Amino acid sequence: SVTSDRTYYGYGDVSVKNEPVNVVVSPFSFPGANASLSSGGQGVFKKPD
Amino acid sequence: SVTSDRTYYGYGDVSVKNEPVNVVVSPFSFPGANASLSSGGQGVFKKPD
Ligand SMILES: [Ca+2]
């Protein structure tokens, strides 16, 4: 009578949500406060973070 | 008188009910919980059962 269609199934799901990286920024204001930059001046400025 | 029609019978029956196999499935959610998948990421996921 019944000629079974021999076909069973298995399934799965994958969730890719985020991007690998977050670039958190703290911008710099290099002449800063309690220091001074002059025209034609020479030197170095550094922000560690 | 009676000319016996010499024909006796034997019979039998066979019961084919089930299909050979049962594919029980536990689907996978591969990023899972307490783990994370990122875009462009590389690695391995495994489900034992
Ligand atoms: Ca990885």
Q: Which of B32, B33, B30, B27 is nearest to B45 (CA)?
A: B30
The two counts, helices (H) then strands (E), for chain B are: 0, 1
**Cβ distance B26 to A10 under 8 Å?**
no
Q: Which of B47, B45, B25 is nearest to B35 (CA)?
A: B45
**A interface residues, B as partner, C-beta within 8 Å:** 4, 6, 8-20
* Count of CA atoms in the C-beta half-sphere (13 A) of A21: 3
Q: Do A11 and B27 touch (CB under 8 A)?
A: yes
Kindly provide the resolution of this structure in angstroms, with one decimal. 3.5
Q: Which of A10, A14, A19 sits opposite B25 (nearest CB)?
A: A10
Q: What's the Cα-to-Cα distance from A11 to each of A3, B35, B36, B48, rounded to whole Å?
A: 25, 21, 20, 15
Question: Cα(A41)–Cα(A31) distance, rounded to whole angstroms?
Answer: 12
Method: cryo-EM
